Amino acid sequence: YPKTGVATSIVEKIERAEFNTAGRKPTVLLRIADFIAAMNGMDAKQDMQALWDAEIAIMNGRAQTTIISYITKYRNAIREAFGDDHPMLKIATGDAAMYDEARRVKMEKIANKHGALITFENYRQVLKICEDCLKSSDPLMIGIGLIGMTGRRPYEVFTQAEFSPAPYGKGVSKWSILFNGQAKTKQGEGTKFGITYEIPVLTRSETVLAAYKRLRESGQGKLWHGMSIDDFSSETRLLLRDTVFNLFEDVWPKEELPKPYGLRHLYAEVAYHNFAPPHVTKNSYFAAILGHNNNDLETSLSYMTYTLPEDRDNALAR
Amino acid sequence: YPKTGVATSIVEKIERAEFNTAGRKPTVLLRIADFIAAMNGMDAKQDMQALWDAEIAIMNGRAQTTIISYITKYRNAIREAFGDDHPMLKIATGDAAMYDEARRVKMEKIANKHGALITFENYRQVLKICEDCLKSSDPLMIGIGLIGMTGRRPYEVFTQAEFSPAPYGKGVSKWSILFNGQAKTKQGEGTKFGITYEIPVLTRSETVLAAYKRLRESGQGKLWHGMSIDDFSSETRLLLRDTVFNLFEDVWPKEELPKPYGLRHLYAEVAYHNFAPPHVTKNSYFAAILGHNNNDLETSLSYMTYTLPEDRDNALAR
DNA sequence: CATAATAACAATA
DNA sequence: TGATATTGTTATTATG
DNA sequence: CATAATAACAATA
DNA sequence: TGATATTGTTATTATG
């Protein structure tokens, strides 16, 4: 197996961070680079294990989620440097207990949310704002609007979404479009990777397609197109966060802060409330419109956080 | 660790089967008994492994579910004979691949069902039948009725259910009772084991409680009380199956045969349709009324098989 | 004298 | 079923 | 001459 | 997160 290699992306991030006007020192990226460095020439399991042990000792005062993420970074770096067949990939990993605990906590949270939904009182107002954003000229705004109206992830919307009209009968669908470029998915049998599939929209198709075309033809939209996730995050995450904070501050449910993904949650809820066929379940429908894998009904549980004032009403009926 | 022991239950089942007027030969129970026999005196891992290998070779032309079940029987027998700390418990197990495949298939099935629900057209008729069964004098019938009206498992209903009135305000609840004696659960932190909890009923509480009291005071009901699962199965499973076949044959959804558990599914569906508070989800509610563990929302997915004609209607609205 | 900028830190799906 | 890819939030750094 | 009875076999949650 | 407890269905056996 390869004994030498370089994690190019890490080295490039580190190099670009040399001439920075301000900001944190890239200590983590540096530890990873030095890690991949020390790995060069290693042929003994125990040495590798000692190196990894050192790194694990380092990130001691961190959150479990944080440590798990960092381990992801290290593993991706090792994989980029030496390939998939390097023994370090068997060593550079967290306790099974850590992952089990993460799963546990996740389930507890989700179940807590299912036990006490948040009534989205002013949801129509939010949807309306998102629709007005489709007419805005600032591509950030068009983006937010498309998130609210299509329930696509930010990364998807800005950097890689392919929207096309959805053919209904022998014309075009008024309330659905064709989305391609699903994120967070590897190539596989039951995945939506590279799969163009029909999703519902919360306004006219023509509107969404027009706005998307505009955003996509904007200079900033051309900058966004094909971006990596890190590039997109560093480029836009805070601006998008602050903007979404600003737009929905007055009309968002008081139990939580306005977040971009909340538009995806709410999109799922509303789309189900308006378009769901009579023979599928809420989980199945969510899984369908969100682009989850086939036979995956467990991820849909993550998106059931709100209840509509109407449902709340005709449940109080009772 | 213990080198000798006896699987008493297996030996007793085998002994009682000696003087049988008819029926299959207990070949499996015999293989298990001979297994536990051969284990007596074994102190070498490789010997144990060879024995287990022999047994695995035996059940070769079986279904995966079957093999998994049999392995459960063997493991329970070993555990009963030698205790929890016997090395064989590390050997007597199936491939991880077998279990993974079982999980896979299960998820595929469940998702298929969520994709294509069965419209329970004549559900009110079924519920009515179940209500009439509460007035019947045959404790089998009272039992079926209580299954339909409380959504308790057969084993629970007949052998171990403790129903009491549910106090509403300062009177009694009309539409809910207190159930104790949840099955398929070990003692634990988030389990309903030994936990008395409030479940909804699909008729008046008084009715259900009266019928349950009658069934419980019947001679057959006194025979049922405290029975093991095997005893109950051999005593009643076929009669219950044939009877439920008979009662609902005309009015059951044409896509499937009338089965006892279908009353539990339908119970969950209807109970949600009638009593669900405005701030919980369908999964959470199911999990609540069915007695599933806290933070367990995945088992509830198993019970979403039907859709009501009404929901089908006001989904076609659309 | 103090803020924008950056990546660490962290949580979600 | 092994151990990721996104989104969300805070402490630290350089800069007339 | 043929059926009730039993446990194997199998699937579900 | 390791490897169960129920419910549902079929082949085999003993019996004037």
Within residues 54-83 of protein chain A, the ones with CB less than 7 A from nucleic strand C are 59, 62-66, 68-69
**A114–B297 CB contact, under 8 Å:** yes
Q: Which residues have a Cβ under 8 Å from the Cβ of A276 and sit 6 or more positions away?
A: A282, A285, B315
**B297–A297 CB contact, under 8 Å:** no
B216 upstream amide cis, omega within 30 of 0: no
Q: Which residues have a Cβ under 8 Å from the Cβ of B152 and sit 6 or more positions away?
A: B146, B161, B179, B199, B264
Angstrom CA distances, A90 to A18, A48, A85, stand at 33, 10, 9
Location of structure tokens 């991949």:
A36
Contact call for residues A156 and A274 (beta carbons, < 8 A): no
Alpha carbons A235 and B25: distance in angstroms, whole number: 73
∠ Cα B106 B112 B114 (to 5°): 105
Alpha carbons A73 and A93: distance in angstroms, whole number: 11
**Closest residue by C-alpha to C1' distance, nucleotide C3:** A22
- A116 min Cα distance to partner chain B (Å): 5
Contact call for residues A29 and A36 (beta carbons, < 8 A): no
**A284–B115 CB contact, under 8 Å:** yes
Tokens of B116: 């294509």
Tokens of B139: 């404790």
Identify nearest nucleotide to residue A31 by CA to C1′ distance. C8
**A278–B107 CB contact, under 8 Å:** no
Nearest to A275 by CA among A206, A208, A207, A200: A200
Q: Which of A281, A299, A314, A318 best tests the B interface by mutation, with the highest count of B CBs <10 A?
A: A281
3-state secondary structure of A169: coil
Residue B207 CA to its chain's centroid (Å): 24
* CA atom of B145 to C1′ atom of E9, Å: 29
Contact call for residues A114 and A304 (beta carbons, < 8 A): yes
Contact call for residues A234 and A224 (beta carbons, < 8 A): no
Beta pairing partners, A179: A163, A197
Q: Is the CB of B68 under 7 A from strand F?
A: yes
- A115 min Cα distance to partner chain B (Å): 5
Experimental technique, in short, is X-ray
Tokens of A144: 């937010």
Q: Which of B100, B286, B297 best tests the A interface by mutation, with the highest count of A CBs <10 A?
A: B297
Alpha carbons B13 and A76: distance in angstroms, whole number: 56
Burial class of residue B38 in the structure, from the number of CB atoms within 10 Å of its CB (0-12 exposed, 13-18 middle, 19+ buried)? middle
Determine the residue type at A67.
Answer: I
Rg (C-alpha) for chain B, rounded Å, is 22
**Mind listing the domains of chain A with CATH numbers?**
1-92 (6.10.140.1780), 93-318 (1.10.443.30)
Alpha carbons B175 and B150: distance in angstroms, whole number: 10
- B272 min Cα distance to partner chain A (Å): 10
Within residues 121-160 of protein chain B, the ones with CB less than 7 A from nucleic strand E are none
**Chain A partners within 8 Å of B114 (Cβ):** 280-281, 283-284, 297
Q: Is the CB of A30 under 7 A from strand C?
A: yes
Q: Is the CB of B186 under 7 A from strand E?
A: no
Q: Which of A104, A284, A308 best tests the B interface by mutation, with the highest count of B CBs <10 A?
A: A284
Interface of B with A (CB under 8 A): 104, 107-108, 110-111, 114-117, 119, 275-284, 287, 294-298, 301, 304, 307, 311-313, 315-316, 318
3-state secondary structure of A199: strand
Q: Return phi, psi of residue B316, to 5°.
A: -85, 0
Nucleotides of strand E under 7 angstroms from a protein beta carbon: 3-13
Tokens of B125: 């008729």
Q: Is the CB of B196 under 7 A from strand E?
A: no
E strand or H helix at A272: helix A262-275
Contact call for residues A59 and A66 (beta carbons, < 8 A): yes
* CA atom of A106 to C1′ atom of C11, Å: 10
Nearest to B151 by CA among B267, B286, B248, B233: B267
Contact call for residues B143 and B122 (beta carbons, < 8 A): no
Q: Using CA of residue B56, residue B58, residue B62, residue B67, what is the dihedral sign? A: negative
3-state secondary structure of A165: strand
Location of structure tokens 């349950």:
B212
* CA atom of A72 to C1′ atom of D4, Å: 7
Alpha carbons B264 and B147: distance in angstroms, whole number: 7
* CA atom of B245 to C1′ atom of F6, Å: 20
Interface of A with B (CB under 8 A): 104, 107-108, 110-111, 114-117, 119, 275-284, 287, 294-298, 301, 304, 307, 311-313, 315-316, 318
Beta strands in chain A (DSSP E): 118-119, 162-165, 176-180, 197-200, 306-307
Q: Which of B106, B107, B279 best tests the A interface by mutation, with the highest count of A CBs <10 A?
A: B279
Q: Is the CB of B62 under 7 A from strand F?
A: no
